[PDB]
Amino acid sequence: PGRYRVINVKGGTALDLDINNNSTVHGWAFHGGDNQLWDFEHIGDNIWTICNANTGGYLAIVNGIAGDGVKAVSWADPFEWAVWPDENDGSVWRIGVPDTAFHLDLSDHGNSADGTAVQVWNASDGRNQCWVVEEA
Template identity: 35%
Template sequence: MKFTSIIVSLLAIPAALASALPRNLVSRDTIVDNKTYKITNGKATGIVVDLSAGDNTSIIGYPDHDGDNQKWIFAQSKGAWTIKSAAMDLYIAPNTTTPGNYSALQAIDTPFLWDIWHDEVNSNTYRFFVNNTALNWDLAGYGNPTPGNTVQLFQKYTPGWTWQTWTVTSA
């Protein structure tokens, strides 16, 4: 029993360190306050962040069709960013008040704060973190491009986890 407790404690160390260590501050000059963008997955190219038209709540990966439900307005707030749908007055947020690995993203009516940082491996891509944590967006199933796949949170991993990276382009 004591051995199990030690192992569990050791496994928690990387997540605790990642959230406590400062990230490299990289210019965010390509993201402009109150501008509309499309967000595309770094691995599943052609798959964009989509507010599901099926329930107007789920945040999913879906092939780009240039709909307003695939366009997002970025706004600076309290040293971080909010991300609002261009189709509805809804913001991207975790589906729980205590987010962790595998927490799905959803659309809610109140702003939620995200940290947005360039990826250390590919500076042309971004990572979207729950404010002041190591939890970042992750296209489920290791970047599975199946339409409707969940965009979830998962602890940041590098290098090579390109399904946790995203390109941001003007919409």
Template identity: 35%
Template sequence: MIFTRCLCFFLALPLVLASVIPRYRLATRDTIQSNNTYKITNVKAGNVVDLSGFDNKSIIGYPDHNGTNQRWTLEWTSGSWAIKSFGLGLYIGLDGAAANGTKLVAVSDVATWDIWFDEVNASNYRIFEHNTIQNWDLSDYGNSTPGNPIQTWAEWKGFHQTWKIEQQ
């Protein structure tokens, strides 16, 4: 019985923490304009968020070549952001539930994200699955190898979890 209670507590903890994280960090529509097109660049690796041309599904880090598969339309929807490929009109979503190591993929249905300023450098952003503590993470600690997958991971102070968002 005690074990079950402890297990339930630890499983519910991320949801509780997400609900009390101060929302003042949420990037407002004054900072990012809805329905504009952006390039999203990983701060550590310098690679941009890329919808893989190989499978039109995987969301990866890749050197910038100004492709439409590397440009994203950010849409404000009911208190969070949807991020849509400028080239194919697919949204960035998850290949499963938000958890450490879940890969980002292109999906046809709207998926929503919270975009917050980074606490260490307010000119950078963190992108969280809506109402969770899972944020985008360029895998292998921000390895700049082209094609490195982008996944979700619980927030920690790694620069490979921070992003520049620049209007195009």
């Protein structure tokens, strides 16, 4: 479905599935490889699955239970995300565990460093929780 890149607003790096283990989700400088492209499938009511182009793995969280600092990971099963415009800047998006306050978060204050882990964390104003979803 609609294939998109997902760039962190604060870090400037792409949501990337580690090319070596195909499991760890981290920020990496955008190069346009399939591991940085994500198939957004609309389930309904602006709920989505987000499926890596490289592996077919779905964006999810380790062990499925949302909490502060639970890391993002690739799953063989679908995991549902709410995707909506940020409240302060309508031009960017949040990607969240549905009906929870746990938002997809670029760790270490949205560090631009390649390999910066992506996780979920309680919703804050931080642009490290804001993403640009755009075609590629």
